[PDB]
Design an enzyme around this catalytic site. Structure first.
Site, mmCIF file in Angstrom:
data_model
loop_
_atom_site.group_PDB
_atom_site.id
_atom_site.type_symbol
_atom_site.label_atom_id
_atom_site.label_comp_id
_atom_site.label_asym_id
_atom_site.label_seq_id
_atom_site.Cartn_x
_atom_site.Cartn_y
_atom_site.Cartn_z
ATOM 1 N N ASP A 180 -19.455 21.038 13.993
ATOM 2 C CA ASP A 180 -20.196 20.858 15.073
ATOM 3 C C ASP A 180 -19.193 19.813 15.918
ATOM 4 O OD1 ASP A 180 -22.335 22.092 14.456
ATOM 5 O OD2 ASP A 180 -23.823 20.349 15.068
ATOM 6 N N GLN A 261 -8.704 23.166 23.920
ATOM 7 C CA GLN A 261 -9.763 22.239 24.946
ATOM 8 C C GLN A 261 -9.307 20.767 24.585
ATOM 9 O OE1 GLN A 261 -13.868 24.076 24.425
ATOM 10 N NE2 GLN A 261 -14.005 22.970 26.384
#
EC number: 3.1.3.48
Length: 281
Positions: A180, A261
């Site tokens: 996550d 990212q």
């Protein structure tokens, strides 16, 4: 050589600095079709848009738009479609794109739910006997088989064009263990997964381009394409150490914005290529 570049950046803690120079050198092309008001509900994130020059067009006369880009790596002879995780209203467009581009494989690098929020619509069937019909695009999708492993799941799917009754087999490669937060500690299971996709034939030039997605189609999706392309170039070149990750990433950023990212994803990409090169040399 990148192994020594890795130690330099790591020992000097310069990852955020390298990452920012890539951000500043990256291409910027128009994305006018993505920003049309009729397309607002076809985009998951308002700041993640395909460039007009590289965008995939649907063959439907009404509205040809999907948030997807073709990444063409001329020297490696590899193509990829990078796309967002489909929305409830774009699942039919997603499978139309798979059909029209003659893709053999779909690569999914996210879970449907992460951090307590939905990252993607459930766009494939969960049971053999409960097939999905996409009435807007006239496609039927059946789960044929599912092989669940520790780190990934592989699914055989049958896609049927209800208009022509042609059927194709599609392989769904689902990497289920990306955490996550942050990146995996070791690239070992990610490399294993990338070699399984390669072994399937899904990345081969006798098929249309592989479809690769995460939630936005830029972060984890970027790491997948970057590692694959860099390892292929190291096999092809007379001097494997001429391969510069930073240059490959900037070449890929000509086709879709934002690939990789975070500075941690950049570090992870170096680690994956460095470790994969041991299995290839």
């Amino acid at each position: 050589e990148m192994e020594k570049e890795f130690e330099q950046i790591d020992k000097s803690g310069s990852w955020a600095a390298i990452y920012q120079d890539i951000r500043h050198e990256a291409s910027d092309f128009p994305s006018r079709v993505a920003k049309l008001p009729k397309n607002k509900n076809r985009n998951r994130y308002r700041d993640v848009s395909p460039f007009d020059h590289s965008r995939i067009k649907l063959h439907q006369e009404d509205n040809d738009y999907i948030n997807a880009s073709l990444i063409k790596m001329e020297e490696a002879q590899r193509s990829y479609i990078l796309t967002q995780g489909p929305l409830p209203n774009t699942v039919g467009h997603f499978w139309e794109m798979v059909w029209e581009q003659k893709s053999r494989g779909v690569v999914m690098l996210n879970r449907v739910m992460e951090k307590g929020s939905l990252k993607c619509a459930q766009y494939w069937p969960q049971k053999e006997e409960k097939e999905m019909i996409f009435e807007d695009t006239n496609l039927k999708l059946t789960l044929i088989s599912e092989d669940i492993k520790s780190y990934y799941t592989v699914r055989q799917l049958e896609l049927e064009n209800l208009t022509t009754q042609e059927t194709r087999e599609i392989l769904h490669f689902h990497y289920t263990t990306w955490p996550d937060f942050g990146v995996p500690e070791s690239p070992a299971s990610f490399l294993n997964f990338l070699f399984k996709v390669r072994e399937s034939g899904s990345l081969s030039p006798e098929h249309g381009p592989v479809v690769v997605h995460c939630s936005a189609g830029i972060g984890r999706s970027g790491t997948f394409c970057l590692a694959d392309t860099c390892l292929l170039l190291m096999d092809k070149r007379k001097d494997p150490s001429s391969v510069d990750i930073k240059k490959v990433l900037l070449e890929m950023r000509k086709f879709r914005m934002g690939l990789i990212q975070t500075a941690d994803q950049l570090r992870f990409s170096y680690l994956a290529v460095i470790e994969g090169a041991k299995f290839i040399m």
